[PDB]
Every structure is written in C-alpha cells, then in structure tokens.
Amino acid sequence: QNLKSTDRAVQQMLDKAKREGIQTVWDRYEAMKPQCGFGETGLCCRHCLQGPCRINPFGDEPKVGICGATAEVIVARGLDRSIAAGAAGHSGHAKHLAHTLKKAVQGKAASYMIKDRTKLHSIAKRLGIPTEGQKDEDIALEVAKAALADFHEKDTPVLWVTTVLPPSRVKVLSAHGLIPAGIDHEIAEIMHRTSMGCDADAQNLLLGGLRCSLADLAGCYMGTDLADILFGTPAPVVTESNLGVLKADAVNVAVHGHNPVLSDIIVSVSKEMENEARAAGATGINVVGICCTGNEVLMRHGIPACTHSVSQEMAMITGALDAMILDYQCIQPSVATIAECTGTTVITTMEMSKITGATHVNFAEEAAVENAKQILRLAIDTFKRRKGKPVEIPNIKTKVVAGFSTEAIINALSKLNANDPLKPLIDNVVNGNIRGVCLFAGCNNVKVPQDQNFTTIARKLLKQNVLVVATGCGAGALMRHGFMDPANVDELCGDGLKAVLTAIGEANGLGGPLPPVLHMGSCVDNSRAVALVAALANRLGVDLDRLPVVASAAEAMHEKAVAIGTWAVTIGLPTHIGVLPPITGSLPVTQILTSSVKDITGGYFIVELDPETAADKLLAAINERRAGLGLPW
Amino acid sequence: QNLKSTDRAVQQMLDKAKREGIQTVWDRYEAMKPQCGFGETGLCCRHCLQGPCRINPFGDEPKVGICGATAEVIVARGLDRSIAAGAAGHSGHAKHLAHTLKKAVQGKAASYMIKDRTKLHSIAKRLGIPTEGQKDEDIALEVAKAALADFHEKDTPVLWVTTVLPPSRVKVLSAHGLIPAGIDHEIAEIMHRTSMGCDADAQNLLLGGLRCSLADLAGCYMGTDLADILFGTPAPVVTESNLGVLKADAVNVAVHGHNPVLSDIIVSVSKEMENEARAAGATGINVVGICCTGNEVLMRHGIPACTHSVSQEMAMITGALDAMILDYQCIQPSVATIAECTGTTVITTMEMSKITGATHVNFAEEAAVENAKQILRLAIDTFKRRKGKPVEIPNIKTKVVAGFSTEAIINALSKLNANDPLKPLIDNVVNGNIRGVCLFAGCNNVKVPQDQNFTTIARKLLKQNVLVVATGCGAGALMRHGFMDPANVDELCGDGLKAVLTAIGEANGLGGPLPPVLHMGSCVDNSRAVALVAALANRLGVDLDRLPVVASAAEAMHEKAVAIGTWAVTIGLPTHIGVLPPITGSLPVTQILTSSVKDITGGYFIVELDPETAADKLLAAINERRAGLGLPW
C-alpha cells in the first residue's frame, strides 16, 4: 500500500477497502494498464469524424493525420484545449462568485454580504472604480459588473490580468499579443482555432495557449478577490488535517469541490444546527474539508482538512462520513457508487454538475440557509442510520498552521519593518538566508505514489533555505505530512530559513517560528502567490523573470493544473511539472515549452518525473536567477 | 478511384496525384487503417493527466475510467466538447462579421457598407430595435451591439435563438432549460462541466449539449443575418461547378474557408485588377470557390465553385491553381505542403489560423482593398511562373442555378400567391405533390466514397416527391452531380414535384422549372432553412416537430456538423447522420440521442451508414409527420 500512497491513514483505508471488496482509484488505474501510448505522447486526434487519427512516435505510418495535421499541430491543439478547459473551470467559479456578490448587494441574497470592506475598496482602486463618497453596495456592484465584463470583449482588455501584473510584464506580454481580450472569448477562440482545418502552426497555436492561460489567471485572481470580499481575507489560523479529524460520535460532513459560496454557508449553518444534531444523538456537526473548497474553509475558518485529491474515496471507507456535499470539479464520480457500500449520503448542488446515483439538492444563493438546512438534515438522518455500526477512523492527524494570504504575509513581515514590509524578506534573499521561493501547486495523480514528489522535493528545497509556499492539494500533501506544523522547523529547515521563520514568528507573538511551508490557499489562490511575487517585482523594480521564484506542479492531474502551469510560465517563472503532459510525441512542441518560450516570456517548463532530480533542477533555476541579480548562491 | 470519389473530375486528379507521387487525403486515410476502436466508439478519455483512459466496448477490464467515469459519461462528455467546438467556429465567424459591421458604420472600414437596408430593418424589428426616425448607421450600430451582446450573459437570453423560433418552440425549450444564456458563456460552461470531476450524469450532460447546440444555431443565424446586411441577400443566380471552371489562360484564385468578409472583397477587387492580370499575360483573374466561402460568393455573385471538402487538394493537382486564399475552418493543412509540388501560392489571412509553410498576409478590414491587392499580386506573380507549363484541368463542369435564400424562395412562391406566399407550398404538401422537405447539410468524409450518400439519398427522395434543399458541401456534392441544373428535373423528379417546380419556375419567368434541389447557401445558411421552416410552422400554427421536414448530414465530418445536427434535433427535426459519431460505445447515450430525446424536443437522430436504408428511414420519418397532420402518404 505504500506503493499507492505515502499517507499512512490512506494506507490503512486501502487495506479496509481491499478486505471489503470496494474498488478504488488505484484499482481502476491498475485495470487500465497498459495505457495507450498514442494518448500518453499526445499523438492522437479526435477533432473530426474522419478520426480517430494517431501518429506513431517512431517508425512507419501513420506519420500524419488524415487532414494533413502534423504531430506538432496535433500535440499543440490537444494542449490548447486542456488549457481552455482549465480556464473554463476557474473562471466559471469566478463568474459564480461575481453573480453572488451582485445578488447580495442588490438585496436578492441576504445570506451573503460584504465581509471585507477594506479588500473591496482596494480592488475598486486597482480597477479604477471610484470610491470617494460612494456607498459600499454601489462600489461592490461596480466591482461585480467589472468582473462580469472581463468575460467578453470590450474597450479594455481583461483587467484581472492587466491590473495585477507589473506594467513591464504587461508590456512584454502585449508585445507578443498575449493579453486576453475576454475570458470566455479566449476559451471559445481556442476551441475554434483547434477545430479541424483551422490553426496548423505549432508556434501560433502555443501563443494562443499562453494567452488563454492568462484568461485562466484572471479567473483565479477574480475568484480569490471576490471570495475575500464575500467571506473574509484569510489570516493565520491553526487547525488539523488527515482522516483522524473525523469523529465517530459526530455527524461528519465533508465539503468537497471548489466554491466557497456553498461551503462557507454550510459551515455557518452547521453551527446553528448543533442541538438538532445533538437531539439526533450526535455531539454536533463536524464539518471537514476535501479538495479546494476544504482549503477555502480551512483558510478562513480553520475547518480541519480530511483528505485531498486522489485519496478522496478513503474518507468514505472509514464508515463515519455521513454526507459529502459537492459543487463542482475534482470529484471522482466513483463516490456515488462507493456511497452505496459505505452509507454516505453524496449530495450534488449545482445544475451543471450532477452524478448519477447521488441525491441532488439545488442550492440557490437566494435560499442558501434553507437549502443548507435541507442538506444538513439529510446528513443527520444518515448519522442516525449508522447508530451502533463500527467505524474505522485512522487515529492519524497533523497540526496545521495556515491562513497565509498575501495580506497576512505582508502583515507578518511588517512586524519586522512597519513601512517597508517586503524589505526584510528581500534582505534575507540577498544575504542568502532565503535562497529563493518555490510555490507547490496542483493535484495528486494516481500514477505517482501519493505525495511522494511534493514531500521529496520540499525536503530538499527547505534544507537549501528555500521559502516554500503551497496551494491546493500540494498544500494538502504538505499539511498531511507535517510541513505546516512549526514543531517541525528544526528537522526540516536549513539554518538560514529557520532563522527567518523564527524571527517573523517571534515578532508576531506566538513564541516560535512560522511553519516550514506557508499555506496560501486554494488553487484559485495561486493568484495570491502572483500578488506576492508581483509586489516583490515592483519593490525591486524588476520583472518577474528576474526573481528567484519557481513553481512546481509536482503531481499534476487536472486540466486546471495545466492551465496554472502554463500561466506560471507566461508570467515569467521556471515551472516544474512532475507528471508527463501529452507533449513528448512532438519534439518541436516540447522544445518550445521547455526552452524557446524563455525568449518570449522568460519562464519555461521543467518536465521531470524523478523528484530528487526535479529538486536539483529547481535549485539550479533559483540559483541562475540569483546569479542574474548579482547575488551569491 | 471510384471507390474514393464518385466525382469523375476528382477521379482524374487522383490518377494525376498517383503518377506524380503526391500524397492525398485518401492515401493518409489508408495509412491510418485500422483506426482505433476506442476512439471510433467514443470509449476514450484524455480529460486529465491520469489518462488516457479507455473502456472496452465488450468483454473484461477496463470497464470504467480511472476517476470512476462510466462509458455513458465519457461518451457524453466527448460529444459535448465537439458541440462546443462547432459552436465556437460558427459563432467566431459571426463575431467577426459583427465587428466588421460596427467598424463599417463607425467610419473605420470604408470597404464595407450596408448593402441590404431592407434586411437591416427587418432584423432590427425582429430584435426590438427602433427604426422610425433613426439613421441606418445608428440602427446598424445597435444591431451589431446586440449581436456582440448575445455572446455573454445579460438581462435577456440569446436573442438569435429566442427571436428566430416560434414562441411555442421557445416555450418547450425553456421548460427544459435549453435556451442559451450567452454564446461564449455556453461554450465555456460545456468545457467546465466536461472537465474532470464535474458533470457525470449522461442525461444532464446531453441536455447541456442541446443548449450549446442552440448557441451554435444562434451563431449560424447571426452570421447569415450580418453577411446579408453587409454583402446582400442572395437571389437566384446561374453559374457552374467542378474543376472545369478553372481556366489555364487565367490567373486562377480559389477562395477557401468560411467568412465573406474576406472573399467578398477578393471578388470585387479581382475585377478591378483585370488589366494588371492581362499585363501579366493572363486573360483576367478567375476567382473560384472552395467550401463555404466559395458558397457565399456563389450565392451572392455567381462565382463558380471549383470543389468542396474532402477533394479540395485536387484543385491544386491540376497545376493551374495560382493562389488559394484562406481564412479559417475546413482547410486541410496538407495544402501547404502540396503547394510545394504544384506551384500554388497558399495564403493565410487571419491571426488565429496559420499553416506552417503558407505565406501569411494579414487581412485587416480597415485596409481590405489594399490587403486584397497585395494578395492578388502574389497570385499574378504565380501565374507568370507557370508560363509554358502544361496543366491538366478536367473538362468537367455542371450548370448550377443557386441563390435560394428564404427571401428568394418566398418571393418565387409569391408569384403564385402574392399575399400568402407560403400557401402554394403548403397546398402541394397537403395534396401530396410535395411529400415533405429534406435539408442536406454538412461535409464529405473520407470514410464514405465522396458524394455517394448525398446523391443516393437525394435520388430516392426526389423520386418520392420530396422538396430537397441543401447547404454547405452537401449543396456542393449535389451541384457537382447536376442536381442544381433544371435540365435534370425530368430525370430526377417525381411527377408531383416536377409539376410544382415547373409551376413556380414558369411564374418567375425562366421558361422552365426551378432546379431539382434548392441551394440555400453556406453552412451558417442552414439558418435560412430554419427561417423557412419556422415561417411554415407559424403559418400553420403548429410547432416544428409536427412538420414533414427532415435533415440529413449524410457524409458529416467537422465538429460544426455535429453541432448543426444537434440543433436540428433540438428544434424538432428527424436528423439523419450518415457516418458514425463516437457514441456507439454507450447504449444509454445512443438511446437518448436516437429515441428518448423525442420526448424532450420532438426531434431525434437517425444514425444510418447505408444510404438506401437512410433514404427509407427519412421517408418513413416524413410520412409519420404527414400522418400526424391527418394527411395521406
């Protein structure tokens, strides 16, 4: 079982699933081997009804698609569609929040409100929306309207790109035609240009992909911005992670998917339904997180994280998960079938994301509290059904310090330098106590023993004094292995980094260091890392492609992760991916993505499946940037 | 060679390509056999980096995707993405025209203008835009703004759906949640819901596909509307088709792709460059059409059609094609490589559709005449290079009567009944002289001997007194085989249909019948068939699903054709497809699309690869509708 997951709680549940005859994602993967080599290399096209077409990576025919599409066209078109799909997810999330904010301030959804007025005003200023003598509700209406306007063409480009990157970066991108005109406009143009008999030049196709990836960035940044307005900007919080956060004697409710519009309300209503739960024989409702919506409520409310990504089924296998409340994205549809075995009530809530066999309870923002109560009463009923049934919750959890929004990191640093908060961080980059910054992002992937790449790479980087930040299920991996517990600083961190984390933590009152890794939130909250890195660039007067900052999507899975990796490259970062994207069937495309793009954006992909080697390559990238700034390394 | 194409001109050029060692689409198809059975059946998924996943149609594992995606989820998700891709193409075309109209009336593109003021006013009225006391330029600005507004969410749904179908049809669709909210909004929502871990219910997914197909319909209708405003509504015209329209002693220029914004200007500028051409030793510039942009200039200007779809390379093989001027969609990228062999100058013009090895000449609507002259001078130079080179133009052409816009059909009918023009058509449906109506649409496909299904089905239907209309490369097939020459009425048509075509043609002055098949235009001009059928529905006071009207995408290829077939079903038509879409790997999805959808929209797919059987099934569908109206059959 350690060949499947490096998480001991997951291993324990894999043994339980095995002896109970419950098929898991790992079993489904085994049943898929050997996987198709055409698909693995990207040398397959189904873009018209003359297909399917394939190209042998090596040897004899077929060498070309039926319409004449070359390997580099086919590979580039497939990649572009994955970027567009990712952009569609993050920006769909953002759109949902924009409509929620609009309804809130129009009096149509009283369960929602402006919680972070300071954030609202800062965003308005950034967008050029007047605030002086205006009512907050009117400012918010204008911010929501601006968010929606960025989905289509208008007299300005996408402001959630052009107003969040430094002017010099916008200039580089504009010179290459990479600034998106509208989010949904770019998604549609990708689908058009990649359809049969359209774009058939690899460089042209890939430039289109870079532009669409910036539409994805805009959607991420918009989603973080609007969620902070509505639900509060995260600040440091302490909680726990892993399956041991479930409680046999409570009604255990997982929030799973992505959007806090749903989960945030589940959290607050669950508190109000405590004596209902107790009337049912439970101690209360224990809300726990899975995937990014779990990260959202962890960051804002300290809701403990149950599990993440590939291991999500394992929460159900305990026998203790009374409900799994879903919105969209990254939910294995197997959960609907496993629920039949485990007793769990799986509940979908969004019209565009249903799962055959799950109960659907429409969630309307206009009726959010009532809908939440209906959902939570299903969960209480489920608890009652498992009275007297044995459960097997692994007694395995870690302590997690999280909540490191960009605002929170600046505020923490400000305790060392009140009027120049980024300077103490830069000072320690310059003196070598901080070698550079690495963002871990993205998924787990069944092909990689769960968490092995994240923890292997992070350990090497921490020992080398890298400041490590994380989001999504990368943060999930790290938190479940103790990388968010300050008690582990002495073991994990180099002496430089330890000194810095200790100095900040002591100056912020909590008699000890910051944690080894800073949790910056959900996958849309990769945008927070952009805000931090853009602020450093502006403070230093250099573009992002000069900074000693890298990213690693160490165990990537979703199309969303492909989009994020691509915008990380587009904004100027060396960006590791630890699984193979379907590009190796075309050397010219691989060379563009890993080498020639450096001449366009300054960023580049590092494709490396061996995590020790990946760590070495990431350190080399950081140190090259250090040398370019005239720094020792 | 007759096993490849039933077109004798194509056969002749296949012999020339063979003896010259020039690889064709048919050769590339042969080199692809046997094709992947997983892709053919739709049982393959590459929506995340855990894939590729496949499902055996029958037998043992794999039985399910790695995430738990079932065969019916996988099939439905793939189909939905193809619909979204098609919608992205037609609506991208429409968007381009909307921006062109806006520039024209704002004084930014003087090469363009309002040519059809009557059409402009009719569209404005339909959309609810005031015209009384308004300047045409202001009305046009408002129409262009409305077109652009339909791409995104707003306070109304997509007006290029809701204002073009009868209220009772809008009501049916709205009750099922099928009216699109915005064109690009729907495309993006499809990409989201079909990404990993989102929608996983076949019926839900397919309803999403139906709604996205209506976004495609909107794009088609918008494209026809705007092109008519800018370039004129078609009226009956006489021209010729097939490779014999090329002229060895002229500069032969093919317009290929889709958008008249390009081709229309090539036509008018080519006339002005006649003595330049003659100075070069040519008789003039001979503009000829390929694919839909060829159909656009055929319909409006009588520009002869060279060839279509699968056989497009054959125009180059003659040795006489001096230039091929491209915008986007349905262009085999092989043309860039074949041009090296044949001498032809292949020229791309749009930023999102380039082909490695082709010359790119940006075309800006603001500079259209100058850009056109630059392009045409490349073509004249190419002519000069082939002085003294033998060419082989098959001496094979047909006469084509075309230009049957809906307005043109109504006007023709009005010669028999001035104030109730649809009544003579309905009278002859009722008395059985016209059994029903069949629309042929869509592509050729290399899997089917070229044109075999279109001509086989059309011959059977015509003998059975069906009024046959055609668009796109279905019209192309029919015209190249003589179905648009009135001289062939006695041979092809049943006595009822012959009597009707004769009575209309005689009443319209041209001493003989209308042609056997009415050419209604390009693929976006499938929207014209909708306008005709909606007008018949309104005149009879019934919905479209009661009318004896069917469609046949007899040799479908592009994602666009999938989208069109799907909206034909959604608006209420029995819709034949003569190639296998990738759905047969899921019986539940197949049953929805071919049977249960009848209970939702009244329409349904008829999947039938044998064209004699397809004809029988289409006649049975027509006659079932006749019986439902209380008519003899």
Ligand code: SF4
């Ligand atoms: S677009 Fe070209 S390569 Fe793709 S399936 Fe169609 S013929 Fe094959």
Ligand code: SF4
């Ligand atoms: S979305 Fe599911 S079925 Fe598709 S490639 Fe990923 S794991 Fe496989």
Ligand code: FES
């Ligand atoms: S041939 Fe296997 S992914 Fe298409």
Ligand code: FES
């Ligand atoms: S296994 Fe062949 S299309 Fe994927």
Ligand SMILES: [Fe+2]
């Ligand atoms: Fe996520």
Ligand SMILES: [Fe+2]
């Ligand atoms: Fe077309």
